[PDB]
Amino acid sequence: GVHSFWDIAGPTARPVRLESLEDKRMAVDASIWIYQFLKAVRDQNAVKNSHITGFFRRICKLLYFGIRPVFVFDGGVPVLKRETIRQSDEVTMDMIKEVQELLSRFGIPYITAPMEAEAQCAELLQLNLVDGIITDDSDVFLFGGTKIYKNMFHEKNYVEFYDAESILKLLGLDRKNMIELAQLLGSDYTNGLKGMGPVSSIEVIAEFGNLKNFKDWYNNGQFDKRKQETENKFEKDLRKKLVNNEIILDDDFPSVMVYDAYMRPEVDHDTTPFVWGVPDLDMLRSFMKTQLGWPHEKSDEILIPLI
Amino acid sequence: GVHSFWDIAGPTARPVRLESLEDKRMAVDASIWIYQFLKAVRDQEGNAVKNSHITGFFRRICKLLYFGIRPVFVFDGGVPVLKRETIRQRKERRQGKRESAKSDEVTMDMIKEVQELLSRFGIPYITAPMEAEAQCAELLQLNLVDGIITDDSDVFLFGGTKIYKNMFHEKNYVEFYDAESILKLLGLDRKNMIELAQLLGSDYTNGLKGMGPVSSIEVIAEFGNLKNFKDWYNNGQFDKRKQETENKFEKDLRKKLVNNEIILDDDFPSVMVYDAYMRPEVDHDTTPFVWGVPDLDMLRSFMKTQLGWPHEKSDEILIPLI
DNA sequence: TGCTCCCTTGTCTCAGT
DNA sequence: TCTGAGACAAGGGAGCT
Ligand SMILES: [Ca+2]
Ligand SMILES: [Ca+2]
Ligand SMILES: [K+]
Ligand SMILES: [K+]
């Protein structure tokens, strides 16, 4: 995601009762689930099979509210994202195969994005293969995503609904703005600028319109001492802070590389509608028995009301 | 003062009403008044309004006399070298001076003027050999005064106590601090405080990056002193097994010290810092101060001359006070 | 290879002391 | 060359007048 972006976007959120989600097709961004379950479920070191337990719980929550989910997994890691993150617990191919086997037995379709899952999710919604995106990753907006359902897996009666239109109307931010805002705040595709947090990054986009103007202002004022004498409080304070943080803004700011990565992510344009099956009780018993030692009786009480 | 020391000491404070101070002899640390007035009282343009030192000293004298306090004013003499060097570093640092690799003045005339003003009020004053706070502590110790009025936390490090803080905020009360309440409630004595300053910073030392009020207090409490703290840092340096057997406090503290690239060298703790606070240059004279009565005729003309106040304007304020 | 929340700290600026 | 409070931001660790 973009650092601090959820705080910025938060006040545009609207609460949606889960029951309204019945029969809705939702793209589910599952890209980091296995890793998170690994880190978050431990003992008195990581619990074995937390990926099975974790997926099972959430799949159940989705089906309980009659959501039709399509799961999305990461393909590869884009170069810009490697380079950025290039500045104990591992996700094995088995873990992935297992949760995928689990989804198939639930009758739930899944895909592996060519690259980032959030990017693929936005694509699914653009092609009308889904009606909404379930994700907690704020990168999704920069990839074109709207109709975002955040906090699906907190224990709450509701979920937070975000859309690009509300962001545009309430914060003045369009997609290009959010992409430029990322280069102040930081994201997986850029380190942003040291000293620029949610308050001043928003002020910069609002006062300067775009990073080109912001940079020209910065560079021009550094050159011409007379231009500085006319500067207001916002500019004067901002200038000092940037120089103190050793900020240099050159030819590669804003980044065309960063702009491309968000505007043209590698995605699958396939328009085949997803197929939702039914949970297979017999195969789900044997799966939970094999993997967790759940007696069929135990799977039954949970699964039978869901079918 | 010591950075953040008032945040640390604050909760041991006792709120005290001015009327409880009637007839008390109070040392007044006036060492930065003129400068503060110069900086805090400004033009619509942005300049210092002329003679704010006279206006400032005047209003504060009136508050003291109003509550029947018998003040003796204490001014700085020299500036100790250690204090001099650190202050220029802070000045340059905040002007923007890069410190590592990439990735309005007070004139003798102003002093003479506020001193003539005190004399015409009948109020005694002295000039300390060096720091005014240290001389204030010595006056109390010698029973030449009953309390100390200052906002500078260094006073405790110079052995002061019975400190009346925020006397000149525009408020209905004042905050009282003393050495014993601090020792009882915080476990801090004079030597502890002198070592805290080397973590937190003061006019005599830069302190350690990453050490704020919370961590500094914990270091003093957990290690007792800076020698033990330095010894602990140095002995668990490359013992990877001992570092596993360090509790949470030590483990986190070691990592923070490492992250902040902290070096504790042979001058840590500092003998020189210890001496500046323990043995400051003070005047041990035991002669009692003499309080006089305010001279209306001389105050009238003084205010006339320095501020253009008509006599009746001075009378309206001074007469009820007299 | 994750996240958000909370705690602590650094830095700066305006108004007051 | 001041003080004091507040706003903003960086970073770490725990637990999911
Ligand atoms: Ca992402
Ligand atoms: Ca001092
Ligand atoms: K930033
Ligand atoms: K410090």
Residue numbers in the entry:
A (entry chain B): 2 to 45, 48 to 90, 764 to 983
B (entry chain A): 2 to 104, 765 to 983
What did the authors write?
Rad2/XPG belongs to the flap endonuclease family that encompasses various structure-specific nucleases involved in nucleic acid processing. The unique feature of Rad2/XPG is the recognition of DNA bubbles that comprise a stretch of unpaired bases flanked by double-stranded regions and correspond to the DNA in the NER pre-incision complex. We report four structures of the Rad2 catalytic core solved in four different space groups, three of which represent the productive substrate binding mode and reveal that the protein recognizes a single 5′ nucleotide of the single-stranded portion of the DNA and a 3′ phosphate group of the ss/dsDNA junction. The two critical regions for substrate binding are the H2TH module with a Rad2-specific α-helix 12b and the hydrophobic wedge that binds the first base pair of the double-stranded portion of the DNA.
The structure of complex III was solved at 2.4 Å resolution. It comprised two Rad2-ΔSC molecules bound to a 15-mer DNA duplex with 1 nt single-stranded overhangs in all four ends of the DNA strands. Two copies of complex III were present in the asymmetric unit of its crystals. The productive complexes II–IV have the same overall architecture. In our structures, including complex IV in which the DNA had the longest overhangs (4 nt), we did not observe electron densities for the single-stranded regions of the DNA, except for the single nucleotide in the cleaved (5′ flap) strand that is visible in complexes III and IV. The phosphate group on the 3′ side of this single nucleotide is stabilized by van der Waals interactions with Tyr36 (from N region). For the non-cleaved (3′ flap) DNA strand, in one protein molecule of complex II and three protein molecules of complex III, we observed the electron density for the phosphate group of the ss/dsDNA junction. Several charged residues line a pocket located close to this phosphate: Arg60, Arg61 (both from the N region), His830 and Glu831 (from I region). All eight independently determined protein structures in complexes II–IV are essentially identical, with pairwise root-mean-square deviations (rmsds) between 0.5 and 0.8 Å over 273 to 285 C-α atoms. When all of the protein subunits from the productive complexes II–IV are compared, the DNA superimposes very well at the H2TH module, but its trajectory differs significantly in other regions, particularly around the hydrophobic wedge.
